[model samples]
Target: SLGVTQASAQWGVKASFQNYIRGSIANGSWTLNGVGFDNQQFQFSGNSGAVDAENKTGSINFPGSIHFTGHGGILDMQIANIEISFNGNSGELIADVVSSDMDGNSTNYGRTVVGTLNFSALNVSATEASGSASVSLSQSGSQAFADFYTPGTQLDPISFSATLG
Candidate 1:
């Protein structure tokens, strides 16, 4: 049911993902490091470990605290829009995710337990101590995953809730 090779719902065969990233709110797309998600900042505070990393990109994480049931379906924290503060710091946010059971079979595709989700960014925002260019996300992977819960489904939220912190 986890890992890979699991039974998916009828719709799991084709998982289409579409996502994009906006700029950070603090610097108004002007991140502390000057680069967008395309690159990272080198904001160092001390010698070994200064603030030590240019706080460049603004990413989204979901807390999965808010949920609702509507149209005979349940929606979890599937989308998150966050605001970064200071230069390089650490914090957390609340958001939602789409529960899924993805199947790469192609013939039997679609998540088995598909629903609104609870997801997060493992580690966004990249920076290096020194280099002509620090490393952020790769050109292809720089963008966020997008708001598609459970691999593939044509159902959107009938009624949902969100509160940005």
Candidate 2:
């Protein structure tokens, strides 16, 4: 078994969404917790997981959280504990989500599928794997985003690098 270590990923979620947040309409900003933001992408640090290069299967878990607030707090969303699980070049982006429109009116949707990822482009090697994958919103993810994005909405691509031990 190849154990994954020192894995990290960069995903922008959606460029349009980010622009919306910065626009006057949303008039909002996002905060990070245990996550990194650089060049318009959310940084995710991998915590643990295993991968079988031959079988192309594994699940890597990243621990972090991102909060989005807009419309003077009228729109609030929290996505946390990101995890990427894949089998045969297909995977899902899983996370804990909380969305609300008003104070004290949040809905906690724990460990939901945020989106789908295509791992077909990943370059797997003996020591590491690296590549960029296309991402699309899932039905559940649409709700997580307060239904601002419908299901199957194309999101910014995700690039990841993982070192195996």
Candidate 3:
């Protein structure tokens, strides 16, 4: 331990986990051809393949915003899979796996993200809010380094639902 300049800390967790999700929705299927509102909420999760504190290594977590978009009578989901689902204490906007853009990665591209889900939909006509539900999801896709998680890996069941106004 001669002049030890290293910090020793240890924390380990299995990569496999159940992802619980609770979200609210807005459905205006009465007047509008489909749901016109949006869905948004917070989620809790962990870092993928992330190392423990005692290992002089850190991990990435989500602790972000889970949002949904509705247009042309179709609802679009976004999952910021790159994000690590940390507690709400952290000031991070945890994104969903759908909100993440993995297929758009490029050596020269900073990645591309195009979406129609915003706060504006809440003001539009024929827009009604719905209850929430939690659904389970897998941490899959083409992702490495950020604690490389497997593809098609089954995770926890998330709770989600919708509402109407």
Candidate 4:
């Protein structure tokens, strides 16, 4: 059961995902290159999906937040509320995903700083089969860098996204 198939009302499914980024972290104090600067993972399971066989429509969702290590900071990342819909009747589909959040502690120069992760809009796509599903996400190029340090610090942009199964 790795894809969505058939039709039912409010069915439950399990899921796990991770968003990773490749870039460099730096400041007036320290720096770390394209290695392990921005990365995140999430796990969830429940009746997070629903299907309306009668109406020929259905929707799936994956929502929650987790904490992980990034560069030299402990980042608290939140999965942008996700809800993808299926149009069984017209055989049409729509994908709409929200942006995630990030902020936490950083000890680059014997100090700690807390700030939010800001970036451009996120582009997300998904696919399914029988009893399972998969989501493919991307941020497009290095549109935004993952450098969240204490205020008044030097930083560079990075490309980040998740390829979860």
Candidate 5:
């Protein structure tokens, strides 16, 4: 087993959704915690995981968070602790999410499935792996977005790279 010593990823979530949040209707903004934003994408750094290049099996975890707020505090969402798990030609994108509404009630959906990834689109090697995959929102992911996006909605693609030891 090859240990993933270092890794990073970039995901925009969804362009239109972002626009809606920052647009006139929502009048919202987003904040980052222990994460980076560049070229309209949220950046993440992997802290741990393992990879099996041959079998294409492994998981990588990224530590960071992004919070989105809008609608005069009616909409509040936070996504954190991202993890990508690979199994053969597919995998899942997982995260800790918090969703809230106008009533000020919030639900912490811990370690939920955010999206799906197709590993078949990635390039895997002994020392490094990198690629981009089309991401589709999962049921839990829709809830994470406060039900703004429906499950199976195609979201922005997620691109990632990892350095293995």
Candidate 6:
């Protein structure tokens, strides 16, 4: 059972998410159906109010690493832009999102172009009518830092329970 903080740090998910999670195990568990990452490089846009369910919103760019102008820092990914909400009458949990710039061709947070994690897509959902609401998350892109996804391939599922305030 990896606690919120531990899991976030281990997966390089970002610090903002850890704060959004409040309260006890809020009647639900999240499972990783296909997602991964490494000790990638990260940069905060210093932006806020992205995710509705979150408290102090912002985005964390974990695009592994690359060499561009000067050198490589991190991609300014809009993780906050990711849509997270309940759907249908059952109110199934869902978070379908995507991050870009693997071949770095954009400018953000005053950084230049470089290689990135590329297509970081997540299509997740959970059963609202059940015990302790569980969420299954399947994401695509680099599971490890500095690692490239071969494309058309699938990773394992990572699942777990969640309780939020």
Instruction: Highest lDDT: give the candidate number.
Output: 5
lDDT of 6 at 100: 32
TM for every model, in the order presented, reads: 0.17, 0.92, 0.22, 0.30, 0.93, 0.22
Per-residue CA lDDT of candidate 3, range 23-105, in tens? Answer: 23323111212112222213333322232222222223322222333322233333443322212211121232332233333
Q: What ranges in model 5 sit over 4 Å off?
A: 102-104
Clashing residue pairs in all predictions, respectively, total: 30, 0, 43, 7, 0, 22
lDDT value for model 2: 0.83
Model 4's TM-score against the true structure: 0.30
- List the pairs of residues colliding in candidate 4: 2-132, 2-133, 3-129, 3-130, 3-132, 145-157, 145-158
lDDT of 1 by residue, 37-136 (tens): 2112111111111221234222222111111122122211122221111123322221222321222111221112222222222122233211111112
lDDT of 4 at 79: 25
Instruction: List runs of model 4 lying over 4 Å from the truth.
Output: 1-42, 74-76, 89-134, 138-165
lDDT for each candidate structure: 0.20, 0.83, 0.24, 0.28, 0.86, 0.24
lDDT string, candidate 4, 34-132, tens digits: 112222312233235555544435554434322233444433222222344544322211212112224433222211111112223323234321222
Best by TM-score: 5
Stretches off by above 4 angstroms in model 6 are 1-71, 78-98, 106-147, 162-165
Lowest summed lDDT across 10 adjacent residues in model 2 is found at 100-109
- Which candidate do you rate higher for lDDT, 2 or 3? 2
lDDT of 5 by residue, 1-165 (tens): 888889999998888978998999989999998899888888999758988888988788899899998889888889999888878768888899998955757889888989998754777788987777788899988877767678999988888899988
Which of 1 and 6 is ahead in lDDT? 6
